Design a binder for this molecule. Structure first.
Ligand code: APC
Ligand code: YH2
Ligand code: MG
Ligand code: MG
Ligand code: NA
Ligand code: NA
Length: 157
């Protein structure tokens, strides 16, 4: 049994309903049990052009799946929520990212864990700190509470 953390985002459609449906679907896979859910935050898009605001949250799971089995479940959940993948990036109904998988570090073509951008993203760290303040991010070897920083573009929804 491995403790893992997922980052969820939605910036198109009924964002809150889609996040709540995603959590339910994730929890319904055998080998995944959702054990904690952060508050929802409304967040300014980063890393791209002006786009609709996201709702973001983090989920704690207890899992007996391998990290690649877990990735399959995350991507399937996105498919369930009709995530579009066009030639260019755009708004998405649901994004499910594996942030942490125990203390493991994985660097495969289709999977990087810990998530490569998480340590510089308030839309991850703020909600992650609500549920995983004392969890160690294995690359930096810091607890999440020592990575989190104040960001006024991330607000409680
Ligand atoms: N930690 C991780 N969680 C989820 N997908 C990951 C991942 N590491 C690599 N991937 C790969 O990333 C591929 C594309 O995912 P998208 O969800 O399209 C990137 P996204 O989350 O918009 O961007 P981001 O990674 O900057 O947050 C997936 O098919 C998967 O194989
Ligand atoms: N629309 C759009 C769009 C915006 C940004 C990106 C780059 S990855 C990314 N994910 C998120 C996310 O869940 N939330 C926020 N606030 N910014 C993000 N940036 C990709 C597509
Ligand atoms: Mg993402
Ligand atoms: Mg993703
Ligand atoms: Na389950
Ligand atoms: Na790589």
């Amino acid at each position: 049994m491995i403790q893992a953390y997922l980052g969820l985002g939605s910036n198109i459609g009924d964002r809150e309903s889609q996040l709540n449906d995603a959590i339910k679907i994730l929890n319904e896979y055998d080998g995944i049990s959702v054990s904690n859910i952060s508050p929802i935050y409304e967040t300014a898009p980063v890393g791209y052009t002006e786009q609709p605001n996201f709702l973001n949250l983090c989920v704690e799971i207890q899992t007996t799946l391998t990290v690649l089995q877990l990735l399959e479940c995350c991507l399937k959940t996105e498919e369930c929520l009709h995530r579009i993948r066009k030639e260019r990036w755009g708004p998405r109904t649901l994004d499910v990212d594996i942030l942490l998988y125990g203390e493991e570090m994985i660097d495969l073509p289709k999977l990087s864990v810990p998530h490569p951008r998480m340590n510089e993203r308030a839309f991850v760290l703020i909600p992650l700190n609500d549920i995983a303040a004392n969890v160690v991010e294995p690359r930096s070897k810091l607890k999440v509470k020592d990575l989190v920083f104040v960001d006024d573009s991330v607000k409680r929804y």
